[model samples]
Target chain A: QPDSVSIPITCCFNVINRKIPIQRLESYTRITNIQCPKEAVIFKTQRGKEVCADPKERWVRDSMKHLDQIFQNLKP
Target chain B: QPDSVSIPITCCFNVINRKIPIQRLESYTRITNIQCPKEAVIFKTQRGKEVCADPKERWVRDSMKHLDQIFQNLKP
Candidate 1:
Protein backbone atom coordinates (compact mmCIF):
# COMPACT_ATOMS: atom_id res chain seq x y z
CA GLN A 1 0.00 0.00 0.00
CA PRO A 2 1.81 3.08 -1.23
CA ASP A 3 -0.58 5.09 0.91
CA SER A 4 0.42 8.53 2.11
CA VAL A 5 -2.56 10.19 3.68
CA SER A 6 -5.50 9.75 6.05
CA ILE A 7 -8.72 11.66 6.59
CA PRO A 8 -9.69 14.15 9.29
CA ILE A 9 -13.38 14.95 8.51
CA THR A 10 -13.68 13.27 5.10
CA CYS A 11 -14.47 16.72 3.71
CA CYS A 12 -14.26 17.64 0.02
CA PHE A 13 -11.00 19.51 0.39
CA ASN A 14 -9.55 16.78 2.54
CA VAL A 15 -9.37 14.62 -0.58
CA ILE A 16 -8.84 17.44 -3.03
CA ASN A 17 -5.31 16.29 -3.57
CA ARG A 18 -6.73 12.95 -4.57
CA LYS A 19 -8.79 14.84 -7.09
CA ILE A 20 -6.16 17.33 -8.17
CA PRO A 21 -2.69 16.07 -7.35
CA ILE A 22 -3.13 12.33 -7.13
CA GLN A 23 -6.29 12.54 -9.15
CA ARG A 24 -5.05 10.36 -11.95
CA LEU A 25 -3.08 7.79 -10.04
CA GLU A 26 -6.29 5.93 -9.37
CA SER A 27 -4.26 2.91 -10.32
CA TYR A 28 -2.40 3.31 -7.04
CA THR A 29 -5.54 2.12 -5.37
CA ARG A 30 -5.54 -0.88 -7.71
CA ILE A 31 -9.12 -1.63 -6.74
CA THR A 32 -11.57 0.12 -9.01
CA ASN A 33 -9.19 0.13 -11.96
CA ILE A 34 -10.17 3.73 -12.39
CA GLN A 35 -8.87 5.77 -15.30
CA CYS A 36 -8.27 8.68 -12.97
CA PRO A 37 -7.32 12.10 -14.29
CA LYS A 38 -4.33 11.64 -16.56
CA GLU A 39 -2.56 14.68 -15.20
CA ALA A 40 -2.75 13.67 -11.54
CA VAL A 41 0.35 14.37 -9.44
CA ILE A 42 -0.09 12.17 -6.37
CA PHE A 43 1.02 14.83 -3.90
CA LYS A 44 1.56 13.92 -0.26
CA THR A 45 1.06 16.37 2.60
CA GLN A 46 -0.37 16.37 6.09
CA ARG A 47 -3.94 17.66 6.19
CA GLY A 48 -3.41 19.85 9.24
CA LYS A 49 -0.03 20.80 7.87
CA GLU A 50 -0.84 21.97 4.34
CA VAL A 51 -4.57 22.45 4.39
CA CYS A 52 -5.91 25.63 5.96
CA ALA A 53 -8.53 25.52 8.74
CA ASP A 54 -10.41 28.50 7.31
CA PRO A 55 -11.68 26.95 4.08
CA LYS A 56 -12.80 30.22 2.56
CA GLU A 57 -9.60 32.08 3.21
CA ARG A 58 -7.46 29.17 2.18
CA TRP A 59 -8.89 29.04 -1.30
CA VAL A 60 -9.03 32.82 -1.55
CA ARG A 61 -5.47 33.30 -0.40
CA ASP A 62 -4.25 30.51 -2.62
CA SER A 63 -6.00 31.97 -5.62
CA MET A 64 -4.63 35.43 -4.87
CA LYS A 65 -1.11 34.17 -4.61
CA HIS A 66 -1.40 32.00 -7.68
CA LEU A 67 -3.30 34.52 -9.79
CA ASP A 68 -1.29 37.47 -8.50
CA GLN A 69 1.90 35.81 -9.54
CA ILE A 70 0.60 35.45 -13.05
CA PHE A 71 -0.60 39.06 -13.10
CA GLN A 72 2.62 40.32 -11.55
CA ASN A 73 4.52 39.46 -14.69
CA LEU A 74 2.11 41.62 -16.68
CA LYS A 75 2.39 44.54 -14.26
CA PRO A 76 4.37 47.61 -15.48
CA GLN B 1 -9.56 -4.68 -4.45
CA PRO B 2 -9.70 -5.74 -0.84
CA ASP B 3 -6.89 -3.22 -0.49
CA SER B 4 -4.04 -2.31 1.81
CA VAL B 5 -3.20 1.24 3.08
CA SER B 6 -1.66 3.90 0.76
CA ILE B 7 -1.56 7.26 2.56
CA PRO B 8 1.53 8.84 4.11
CA ILE B 9 0.17 12.26 5.04
CA THR B 10 -2.84 14.39 6.00
CA CYS B 11 -3.76 12.42 9.06
CA CYS B 12 -6.00 12.90 12.12
CA PHE B 13 -6.26 9.24 13.20
CA ASN B 14 -9.37 7.46 14.61
CA VAL B 15 -10.73 5.76 11.50
CA ILE B 16 -9.13 2.83 13.21
CA ASN B 17 -11.75 1.19 10.94
CA ARG B 18 -14.60 2.29 8.69
CA LYS B 19 -17.23 1.41 6.01
CA ILE B 20 -14.82 3.57 4.05
CA PRO B 21 -12.27 0.82 4.35
CA ILE B 22 -14.69 -1.57 2.70
CA GLN B 23 -14.79 0.35 -0.52
CA ARG B 24 -11.21 -0.68 -0.71
CA LEU B 25 -12.73 -4.08 -0.15
CA GLU B 26 -14.43 -3.80 -3.53
CA SER B 27 -15.96 -0.55 -4.66
CA TYR B 28 -12.90 1.23 -3.31
CA THR B 29 -14.01 4.44 -4.97
CA ARG B 30 -17.69 4.79 -5.32
CA ILE B 31 -16.53 8.38 -5.25
CA THR B 32 -17.58 8.85 -1.58
CA ASN B 33 -19.89 7.11 0.87
CA ILE B 34 -17.90 7.08 4.16
CA GLN B 35 -19.30 5.63 7.42
CA CYS B 36 -16.65 3.48 9.08
CA PRO B 37 -14.91 3.34 12.47
CA LYS B 38 -15.41 0.11 14.38
CA GLU B 39 -13.06 -2.80 13.75
CA ALA B 40 -10.49 -2.85 11.00
CA VAL B 41 -6.74 -2.83 10.82
CA ILE B 42 -3.95 -2.70 8.28
CA PHE B 43 -0.37 -3.02 9.52
CA LYS B 44 0.70 -2.56 5.92
CA THR B 45 3.92 -0.88 7.02
CA GLN B 46 6.56 1.31 5.35
CA ARG B 47 6.47 4.88 6.68
CA GLY B 48 10.05 4.64 7.77
CA LYS B 49 9.75 0.97 8.37
CA GLU B 50 11.61 -1.06 10.94
CA VAL B 51 8.28 -2.33 11.86
CA CYS B 52 8.16 1.02 13.63
CA ALA B 53 6.84 4.54 12.96
CA ASP B 54 4.33 4.09 15.78
CA PRO B 55 1.14 5.69 14.49
CA LYS B 56 0.57 7.25 17.93
CA GLU B 57 3.96 8.95 18.07
CA ARG B 58 4.60 9.89 14.47
CA TRP B 59 2.53 13.07 14.74
CA VAL B 60 -0.20 10.61 15.74
CA ARG B 61 1.96 8.51 18.07
CA ASP B 62 0.68 5.32 19.58
CA SER B 63 0.89 5.91 23.34
CA MET B 64 -1.45 3.01 24.00
CA LYS B 65 0.92 0.75 22.06
CA HIS B 66 -1.73 -1.94 21.74
CA LEU B 67 -0.55 -3.02 18.32
CA ASP B 68 3.12 -2.68 19.12
CA GLN B 69 2.89 -4.89 22.18
CA ILE B 70 0.74 -7.31 20.22
CA PHE B 71 3.39 -7.49 17.52
CA GLN B 72 6.10 -8.12 20.11
CA ASN B 73 4.01 -10.78 21.83
CA LEU B 74 3.19 -12.59 18.61
CA LYS B 75 6.77 -12.31 17.36
CA PRO B 76 8.05 -13.85 20.57
Candidate 2:
Protein backbone atom coordinates (compact mmCIF):
# COMPACT_ATOMS: atom_id res chain seq x y z
CA GLN A 1 0.00 0.00 0.00
CA PRO A 2 1.13 3.51 -0.70
CA ASP A 3 1.96 5.80 2.20
CA SER A 4 -0.80 8.22 3.13
CA VAL A 5 -0.07 11.79 2.09
CA SER A 6 -1.63 14.82 3.72
CA ILE A 7 -0.67 18.33 2.64
CA PRO A 8 -2.08 21.65 3.77
CA ILE A 9 -3.65 23.78 1.03
CA THR A 10 -4.03 26.86 3.23
CA CYS A 11 -1.97 27.91 6.23
CA CYS A 12 -2.00 30.53 8.99
CA PHE A 13 -5.50 31.77 9.62
CA ASN A 14 -4.00 32.96 12.90
CA VAL A 15 -0.39 33.61 13.92
CA ILE A 16 1.12 33.37 17.39
CA ASN A 17 2.34 36.70 18.75
CA ARG A 18 5.43 35.34 20.52
CA LYS A 19 8.77 34.50 18.96
CA ILE A 20 9.85 30.92 18.35
CA PRO A 21 13.26 29.85 19.56
CA ILE A 22 15.75 29.66 16.67
CA GLN A 23 16.86 26.18 17.73
CA ARG A 24 13.35 24.77 17.24
CA LEU A 25 13.05 25.82 13.61
CA GLU A 26 14.28 23.58 10.81
CA SER A 27 13.41 25.93 7.93
CA TYR A 28 10.84 28.42 6.69
CA THR A 29 8.81 29.60 3.71
CA ARG A 30 7.23 32.92 2.97
CA ILE A 31 3.42 33.03 2.69
CA THR A 32 2.04 35.83 0.59
CA ASN A 33 -1.25 37.61 1.06
CA ILE A 34 -2.26 36.63 -2.47
CA GLN A 35 -2.33 32.97 -1.52
CA CYS A 36 -3.69 33.21 2.02
CA PRO A 37 -5.64 35.83 3.94
CA LYS A 38 -2.75 36.61 6.24
CA GLU A 39 0.81 37.51 5.18
CA ALA A 40 3.16 35.62 7.46
CA VAL A 41 6.19 33.40 7.68
CA ILE A 42 5.62 29.66 8.02
CA PHE A 43 8.42 28.16 10.06
CA LYS A 44 8.86 24.41 9.85
CA THR A 45 9.74 23.04 13.27
CA GLN A 46 12.34 20.37 13.99
CA ARG A 47 9.48 17.95 14.71
CA GLY A 48 7.82 18.88 11.35
CA LYS A 49 5.05 21.16 12.52
CA GLU A 50 4.32 24.55 10.88
CA VAL A 51 4.21 27.59 13.09
CA CYS A 52 2.88 30.88 11.74
CA ALA A 53 4.20 34.29 12.73
CA ASP A 54 3.85 37.87 11.57
CA PRO A 55 6.52 38.48 8.98
CA LYS A 56 7.03 42.11 10.05
CA GLU A 57 8.05 41.07 13.53
CA ARG A 58 11.73 41.74 14.21
CA TRP A 59 12.42 38.36 15.73
CA VAL A 60 10.69 36.54 12.91
CA ARG A 61 12.85 38.30 10.33
CA ASP A 62 15.92 37.55 12.44
CA SER A 63 15.10 33.86 12.50
CA MET A 64 14.56 33.85 8.75
CA LYS A 65 17.91 35.55 8.20
CA HIS A 66 19.57 32.88 10.34
CA LEU A 67 17.94 30.04 8.43
CA ASP A 68 18.78 31.67 5.09
CA GLN A 69 22.42 31.86 6.09
CA ILE A 70 22.39 28.18 6.98
CA PHE A 71 21.06 27.25 3.55
CA GLN A 72 23.32 29.73 1.76
CA ASN A 73 26.50 28.22 3.20
CA LEU A 74 25.58 24.73 1.91
CA LYS A 75 27.90 23.35 -0.81
CA PRO A 76 26.24 22.93 -4.14
CA GLN B 1 5.97 50.00 0.69
CA PRO B 2 6.40 46.49 2.13
CA ASP B 3 8.06 43.90 -0.04
CA SER B 4 5.55 41.85 -2.02
CA VAL B 5 5.06 38.36 -0.65
CA SER B 6 3.35 35.77 -2.84
CA ILE B 7 2.85 32.30 -1.40
CA PRO B 8 0.95 29.44 -2.98
CA ILE B 9 -2.04 28.26 -0.98
CA THR B 10 -2.59 25.19 -3.19
CA CYS B 11 0.23 23.42 -4.98
CA CYS B 12 0.63 20.62 -7.52
CA PHE B 13 -2.45 20.70 -9.63
CA ASN B 14 -0.15 19.10 -12.18
CA VAL B 15 3.27 17.45 -11.63
CA ILE B 16 6.07 17.03 -14.10
CA ASN B 17 6.90 13.35 -14.68
CA ARG B 18 10.60 13.87 -15.44
CA LYS B 19 13.17 13.94 -12.66
CA ILE B 20 14.78 17.25 -11.70
CA PRO B 21 18.54 17.41 -11.33
CA ILE B 22 19.56 17.17 -7.68
CA GLN B 23 22.01 20.01 -7.99
CA ARG B 24 19.25 22.44 -8.91
CA LEU B 25 17.23 21.66 -5.83
CA GLU B 26 17.98 23.55 -2.62
CA SER B 27 15.16 22.12 -0.46
CA TYR B 28 11.76 20.41 -0.64
CA THR B 29 8.46 19.90 1.14
CA ARG B 30 5.92 17.10 0.82
CA ILE B 31 2.47 17.95 -0.52
CA THR B 32 -0.07 15.39 0.57
CA ASN B 33 -3.17 14.30 -1.35
CA ILE B 34 -5.39 15.53 1.45
CA GLN B 35 -4.71 19.17 0.58
CA CYS B 36 -3.89 18.84 -3.08
CA PRO B 37 -5.48 16.76 -5.80
CA LYS B 38 -2.08 15.33 -6.63
CA GLU B 39 0.34 14.06 -4.00
CA ALA B 40 3.74 15.53 -4.77
CA VAL B 41 7.12 16.62 -3.53
CA ILE B 42 7.52 20.36 -3.93
CA PHE B 43 11.17 20.92 -4.57
CA LYS B 44 12.42 24.44 -3.99
CA THR B 45 15.02 25.33 -6.57
CA GLN B 46 18.25 27.21 -5.97
CA ARG B 47 16.58 30.21 -7.59
CA GLY B 48 13.65 30.03 -5.15
CA LYS B 49 11.06 28.56 -7.50
CA GLU B 50 8.85 25.59 -6.56
CA VAL B 51 8.73 22.59 -8.85
CA CYS B 52 6.23 19.79 -8.25
CA ALA B 53 7.09 16.16 -8.91
CA ASP B 54 5.51 12.77 -8.27
CA PRO B 55 6.46 11.65 -4.81
CA LYS B 56 6.25 7.99 -5.84
CA GLU B 57 8.84 8.36 -8.60
CA ARG B 58 12.23 6.81 -7.85
CA TRP B 59 14.32 9.76 -8.94
CA VAL B 60 12.15 12.15 -7.00
CA ARG B 61 12.59 10.09 -3.84
CA ASP B 62 16.33 9.95 -4.41
CA SER B 63 16.58 13.69 -4.75
CA MET B 64 14.59 14.09 -1.55
CA LYS B 65 16.92 11.76 0.32
CA HIS B 66 19.95 13.68 -0.86
CA LEU B 67 18.52 17.04 0.20
CA ASP B 68 17.39 15.60 3.54
CA GLN B 69 20.92 14.50 4.30
CA ILE B 70 22.24 17.96 3.53
CA PHE B 71 19.86 19.56 6.01
CA GLN B 72 20.41 16.82 8.58
CA ASN B 73 24.13 17.52 8.99
CA LEU B 74 23.67 21.21 9.88
CA LYS B 75 24.99 22.45 13.24
CA PRO B 76 22.24 23.26 15.67
Candidate 3:
Protein backbone atom coordinates (compact mmCIF):
# COMPACT_ATOMS: atom_id res chain seq x y z
CA GLN A 1 0.00 0.00 0.00
CA PRO A 2 1.16 3.55 -0.67
CA ASP A 3 2.07 5.80 2.22
CA SER A 4 -1.17 6.25 4.15
CA VAL A 5 -2.31 8.57 6.86
CA SER A 6 -2.36 7.30 10.44
CA ILE A 7 -5.58 5.68 11.48
CA PRO A 8 -7.53 7.66 14.03
CA ILE A 9 -7.46 6.00 17.44
CA THR A 10 -10.99 4.80 18.20
CA CYS A 11 -10.22 2.79 21.27
CA CYS A 12 -8.13 3.10 24.42
CA PHE A 13 -5.57 0.44 25.27
CA ASN A 14 -5.80 1.08 28.98
CA VAL A 15 -9.41 -0.02 29.03
CA ILE A 16 -8.40 -2.84 26.70
CA ASN A 17 -10.46 -1.13 24.01
CA ARG A 18 -13.39 -1.62 26.35
CA LYS A 19 -14.62 1.93 26.19
CA ILE A 20 -18.12 3.27 26.50
CA PRO A 21 -20.15 6.00 24.88
CA ILE A 22 -19.94 9.63 26.00
CA GLN A 23 -23.30 9.12 27.68
CA ARG A 24 -22.26 6.28 29.98
CA LEU A 25 -18.60 7.15 30.24
CA GLU A 26 -18.92 8.64 33.70
CA SER A 27 -20.68 5.79 35.47
CA TYR A 28 -19.61 2.17 35.89
CA THR A 29 -16.49 1.09 34.07
CA ARG A 30 -17.71 -2.40 33.21
CA ILE A 31 -21.10 -1.29 31.99
CA THR A 32 -19.70 0.98 29.29
CA ASN A 33 -18.98 -0.22 25.76
CA ILE A 34 -15.69 0.04 23.89
CA GLN A 35 -15.32 3.25 21.93
CA CYS A 36 -12.26 5.43 22.40
CA PRO A 37 -11.70 8.75 20.68
CA LYS A 38 -8.40 10.21 19.62
CA GLU A 39 -8.56 12.61 22.54
CA ALA A 40 -9.44 9.89 24.99
CA VAL A 41 -8.28 9.86 28.58
CA ILE A 42 -7.71 6.43 30.05
CA PHE A 43 -8.31 6.10 33.74
CA LYS A 44 -6.73 3.31 35.77
CA THR A 45 -8.14 2.65 39.17
CA GLN A 46 -6.63 0.97 42.21
CA ARG A 47 -9.08 -1.89 41.65
CA GLY A 48 -7.47 -3.32 38.54
CA LYS A 49 -9.93 -1.73 36.14
CA GLU A 50 -9.57 0.82 33.36
CA VAL A 51 -11.99 3.37 31.93
CA CYS A 52 -11.97 5.78 29.00
CA ALA A 53 -13.46 9.16 28.11
CA ASP A 54 -13.37 11.87 25.48
CA PRO A 55 -11.81 15.04 26.84
CA LYS A 56 -13.63 17.32 24.42
CA GLU A 57 -17.11 16.32 25.45
CA ARG A 58 -19.17 18.82 27.37
CA TRP A 59 -19.74 16.49 30.30
CA VAL A 60 -16.03 15.98 30.62
CA ARG A 61 -15.44 19.71 30.47
CA ASP A 62 -17.96 20.36 33.21
CA SER A 63 -16.52 17.65 35.35
CA MET A 64 -13.04 18.99 34.76
CA LYS A 65 -14.19 22.44 35.73
CA HIS A 66 -15.32 21.12 39.07
CA LEU A 67 -12.04 19.34 39.42
CA ASP A 68 -10.01 22.41 38.53
CA GLN A 69 -11.82 24.37 41.19
CA ILE A 70 -10.90 21.74 43.72
CA PHE A 71 -7.25 22.02 42.77
CA GLN A 72 -7.47 25.79 42.93
CA ASN A 73 -8.69 25.46 46.50
CA LEU A 74 -5.43 23.77 47.44
CA LYS A 75 -3.36 26.76 46.39
CA PRO A 76 -1.60 28.27 49.40
CA GLN B 1 2.77 28.29 63.53
CA PRO B 2 6.25 27.37 62.28
CA ASP B 3 6.87 27.22 58.53
CA SER B 4 3.55 25.57 57.62
CA VAL B 5 3.81 22.23 55.97
CA SER B 6 1.80 21.74 52.81
CA ILE B 7 -1.35 19.75 53.44
CA PRO B 8 -1.13 16.40 51.73
CA ILE B 9 -3.98 16.15 49.24
CA THR B 10 -6.44 13.57 50.46
CA CYS B 11 -8.94 14.31 47.72
CA CYS B 12 -8.93 14.84 43.97
CA PHE B 13 -10.41 18.11 42.78
CA ASN B 14 -11.23 16.53 39.46
CA VAL B 15 -13.49 14.11 41.22
CA ILE B 16 -14.42 16.89 43.57
CA ASN B 17 -12.34 14.89 46.00
CA ARG B 18 -15.17 12.36 45.77
CA LYS B 19 -12.74 9.52 45.89
CA ILE B 20 -13.44 6.03 47.08
CA PRO B 21 -11.39 3.22 48.52
CA ILE B 22 -9.03 1.37 46.21
CA GLN B 23 -11.48 -1.50 46.15
CA ARG B 24 -14.48 0.31 44.63
CA LEU B 25 -12.58 2.71 42.40
CA GLU B 26 -12.75 0.78 39.15
CA SER B 27 -16.45 0.06 38.98
CA TYR B 28 -18.50 3.22 39.31
CA THR B 29 -17.62 6.89 39.68
CA ARG B 30 -20.56 8.25 41.64
CA ILE B 31 -20.75 5.38 44.10
CA THR B 32 -17.28 6.16 45.34
CA ASN B 33 -16.66 8.33 48.38
CA ILE B 34 -14.94 11.68 48.78
CA GLN B 35 -11.34 10.76 49.44
CA CYS B 36 -8.18 11.42 47.50
CA PRO B 37 -4.62 10.26 47.88
CA LYS B 38 -1.58 12.45 47.46
CA GLU B 39 -0.61 10.25 44.54
CA ALA B 40 -4.02 10.16 42.96
CA VAL B 41 -5.08 9.81 39.34
CA ILE B 42 -8.26 11.68 38.63
CA PHE B 43 -10.58 10.32 35.92
CA LYS B 44 -12.93 12.67 34.07
CA THR B 45 -15.68 11.19 31.96
CA GLN B 46 -18.12 12.53 29.36
CA ARG B 47 -20.93 12.09 31.86
CA GLY B 48 -20.22 14.97 34.20
CA LYS B 49 -18.57 12.84 36.86
CA GLU B 50 -15.06 12.33 38.17
CA VAL B 51 -13.22 9.40 39.71
CA CYS B 52 -9.98 9.09 41.62
CA ALA B 53 -7.41 6.36 42.24
CA ASP B 54 -4.22 5.96 44.22
CA PRO B 55 -1.16 5.30 42.07
CA LYS B 56 0.61 3.37 44.83
CA GLU B 57 -2.05 0.68 45.05
CA ARG B 58 -1.40 -2.71 43.50
CA TRP B 59 -4.64 -2.57 41.56
CA VAL B 60 -3.68 0.71 39.95
CA ARG B 61 -0.35 -0.72 38.87
CA ASP B 62 -2.00 -3.71 37.32
CA SER B 63 -4.56 -1.60 35.59
CA MET B 64 -1.82 0.65 34.28
CA LYS B 65 -0.02 -2.36 32.90
CA HIS B 66 -3.14 -3.34 31.04
CA LEU B 67 -3.63 0.20 29.81
CA ASP B 68 -0.03 0.41 28.66
CA GLN B 69 -0.58 -2.70 26.59
CA ILE B 70 -3.45 -0.98 24.81
CA PHE B 71 -1.31 2.03 24.00
CA GLN B 72 1.38 -0.30 22.71
CA ASN B 73 -1.15 -1.84 20.35
CA LEU B 74 -1.63 1.48 18.62
CA LYS B 75 2.08 1.79 17.88
CA PRO B 76 3.04 1.50 14.25
Candidate topping DockQ: 3
True contacts kept of each: 0.00, 0.00, 0.00
> Chain A: TM-score in each candidate?
0.24, 0.78, 0.40
Q: What is candidate 3's lDDT per residue for A1-76, written digit by digit as tens?
A: 5443344434554423333322222222222334543445554333435566555655554434433333333232
Write down the lDDT of every candidate, Cα atoms only.
0.24, 0.71, 0.40
lDDT of 2 at A25: 66
Worst 10 residues of 3 chain B by lDDT: B22-31
Candidate 2 pairs with clashing backbones:
none
Task: Give the lDDT ranking, best first.
Answer: 2, 3, 1
Query: Whose TM-score is higher: candidate 1's or candidate 2's?
Result: 2
Off by over 4 Å in 3: A1-76, B1-37, B44-48
Q: Per-residue CA lDDT of candidate 1, range B1-76, in tens?
A: 3343443323223433211111111101111213332222333221211121223333223222322322233321
DockQ of each: 0.01, 0.02, 0.05
Candidate 1 lDDT, tens digit per residue, A1-76?
Answer: 3343332222222334222221111111111213332221122222312322222334333332322232332222
Kindly state the fnat score of candidate 3: 0.00
List, residue by residue over A1-76, the lDDT tens digit for candidate 2.
Answer: 3342343466688997877655566677877546578888888876778998998888787667656754875544
A35 Cα displacement, candidate 3 (Å)? 29
* Decreasing TM-score order of the candidates: 2, 3, 1
